Amino acid sequence: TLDRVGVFAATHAAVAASDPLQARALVLQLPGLNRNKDVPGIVGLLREFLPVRGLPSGWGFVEAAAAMRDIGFFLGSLKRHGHEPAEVVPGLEPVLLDLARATNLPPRETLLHVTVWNPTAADAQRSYTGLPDEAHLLESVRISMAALEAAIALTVELFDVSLRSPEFAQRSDELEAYLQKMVESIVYAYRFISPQVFYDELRPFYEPIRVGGQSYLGPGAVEMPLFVLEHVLWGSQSDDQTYREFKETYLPYVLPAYRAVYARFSGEPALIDRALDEARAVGTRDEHVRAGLTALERVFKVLLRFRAPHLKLAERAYEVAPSMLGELLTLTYAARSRVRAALD
Ligand code: HEM
Ligand SMILES: N[C@@H](Cc1c[nH]c2c(Cl)cccc12)C(=O)O
């Protein structure tokens, strides 16, 4: 039914199935060490598989990203106990920079490494804490990530589709159905994840680390390239500084394609800006214009069905949240309102 998801999931699975450092049984031991707060043990465990003499030259993106995933869980772990991994692990930083080069991504772990590039089986899944809530946390992202990537593709395609065309409404309705997975993610999180366990036990593992003379943020669903999708959809031309800064902050953490998608659309008006300009020039008595705008409004409706419940979720945990959440929600409502005013 959401048939575009399959190829994305299949590329994720290629990385999930890769164990080039033969680290599976070793990374499974990390949660026990984190529970004991055993920093020397954690370093000693990494040094058991960490390449000291470089990366095998037969490797490609898949193996390098898999290697970054396995070393990566030790990065957030060591920082969680108060230590810069690059300061406490000999030869680690060069390795991290080599993997950042091989994958064209930061020299640490990201959301991608800890979720969709991370195998799902109990005898294989990598984790910081080994907690049920962490298992649930990773799954919440696996629900929607492949659908999100498909949604980005659909958004780029929709950009060049004229509102006068019946394709616009059809494409808009299809983009909605993919973004509905974002809502499924939140419903799943609110049902299965303890806010208190997240804040007290999970969140301490996602702090920044210093590599190469700069700071790199830890894994978060904030790194999901939804912001790129909405760059193209509504936000590219926005003059909100805080929002611009927010997008530029997480940009390095997404796949290179989406960094390129983002670059391509910064110089153009957003989809919403073109669609509304077209609607005012043609008229709303054109049925394809009416259906186009109606379906586009439902796209904004589903984004809000993710974003509003997600704010409550974050505030519930931080009751045990960064204000940008509220600001982004307000912006999205304004965009939806513009689409509504196009029909009222
Ligand atoms: C208890 C669970 C969760 C908490 C406490 C939480 C909290 C937060 C916080 C505090 C931010 C602000 C950015 C920052 O970290 O500084 C944020 C942003 C974000 N989060 Fe979550 N989150 C949770 C679950 C999820 C889930 C399940 C998803 C989707 C799978 C998700 C997707 C996003 C996205 C896409 C953003 C960027 C802002 C936006 O699009 O509105 N989060 N979240
Ligand atoms: N969405 C929030 C909560 C979060 C932290 N790490 C996460 C992971 Cl690893 C998966 C899903 C959500 C989160 C964030 O990006 O910080």
Side-chain angles (χ1 to χ4, degrees):
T1 293
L2 302 173
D3 58 358
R4 293 161 179 267
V5 154
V7 69
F8 295 103
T11 62
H12 299 162
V15 188
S18 188
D19 192 4
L21 295 173
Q22 294 188 179
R24 185 187 59 98
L26 295 173
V27 201
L28 281 182
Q29 299 176 25
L30 177 73
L33 298 185
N34 277 326
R35 181 153 61 246
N36 303 326
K37 303 185 164 85
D38 187 357
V39 178
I42 295 165
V43 169
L45 188 61
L46 178 59
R47 299 198 72 186
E48 280 191 57
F49 67 90
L50 182 76
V52 287
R53 300 184 172 233
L55 318 175
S57 44
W59 279 15
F61 177 91
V62 165
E63 296 77 22
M68 181 64 84
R69 168 203 68 215
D70 290 339
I71 297 158
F73 283 89
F74 294 79
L75 310 183
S77 295
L78 286 166
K79 182 66 187 184
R80 188 270 173 273
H81 307 299
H83 301 291
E84 284 294 345
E87 279 174 17
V88 294
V89 193
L92 168 71
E93 190 177 2
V95 169
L96 292 174
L97 290 167
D98 281 353
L99 299 166
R101 155 141 142 107
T103 59
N104 192 17
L105 283 163
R108 66 159 317 171
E109 84 286 23
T110 68
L111 181 74
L112 291 155
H113 301 84
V114 310
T115 62
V116 301
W117 292 346
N118 186 15
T120 57
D123 73 349
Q125 186 166 284
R126 283 67 165 159
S127 177
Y128 294 101
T129 75
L131 290 172
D133 292 89
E134 191 180 349
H136 300 319
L137 190 71
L138 308 186
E139 166 65 14
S140 72
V141 174
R142 294 171 175 152
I143 285 172
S144 52
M145 176 74 86
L148 177 53
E149 299 175 303
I152 293 163
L154 301 173
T155 305
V156 178
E157 290 175 29
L158 182 61
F159 193 91
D160 301 316
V161 178
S162 178
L163 198 75
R164 305 201 75 170
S165 175
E167 273 205 48
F168 198 102
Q170 297 168 155
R171 305 263 202 164
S172 294
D173 282 331
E174 180 190 25
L175 172 61
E176 197 269 359
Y178 282 83
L179 286 167
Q180 175 66 46
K181 290 296 184 171
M182 292 303 296
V183 187
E184 205 195 315
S185 284
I186 297 314
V187 172
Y188 185 95
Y190 203 79
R191 185 181 176 183
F192 294 108
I193 302 161
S194 173
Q196 175 274 117
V197 174
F198 175 82
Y199 187 94
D200 291 355
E201 305 297 335
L202 306 182
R203 187 192 60 95
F205 283 92
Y206 316 131
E207 292 292 278
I209 66 170
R210 281 188 79 72
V211 187
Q214 65 181 279
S215 187
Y216 292 101
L217 303 165
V222 69
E223 291 171 342
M224 284 182 96
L226 179 69
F227 71 94
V228 178
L229 187 157
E230 288 179 282
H231 191 66
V232 188
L233 179 57
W234 65 261
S236 66
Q237 261 205 311
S238 189
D239 53 12
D240 193 307
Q241 166 82 94
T242 318
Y243 166 60
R244 193 165 222 170
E245 283 181 25
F246 160 66
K247 291 183 299 188
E248 287 180 17
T249 294
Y250 297 97
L251 209 48
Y253 300 92
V254 301
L255 287 174
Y258 307 142
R259 310 212 285 273
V261 167
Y262 181 102
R264 189 197 159 178
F265 288 99
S266 307
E268 326 223 71
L271 206 157
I272 195 184
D273 294 304
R274 189 273 303 183
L276 304 175
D277 280 18
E278 188 167 35
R280 275 186 309 279
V282 176
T284 52
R285 253 147 70 190
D286 188 293
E287 176 56 46
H288 297 112
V289 171
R290 273 211 89 94
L293 293 173
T294 297
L296 181 62
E297 194 197 331
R298 298 191 283 259
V299 172
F300 286 96
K301 193 177 149 305
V302 66
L303 290 159
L304 290 162
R305 278 183 49 229
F306 155 77
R307 187 155 292 127
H310 173 269
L311 178 55
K312 286 191 172 75
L313 175 75
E315 282 175 338
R316 192 178 66 165
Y318 288 73
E319 200 103 4
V320 177
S323 192
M324 132 260 161
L325 289 178
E327 285 153 358
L328 192 45
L329 183 52
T330 309
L331 285 180
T332 316
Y333 275 126
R336 187 192 77 185
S337 286
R338 278 169 65 210
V339 179
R340 268 186 52 94
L343 298 159
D344 300 353

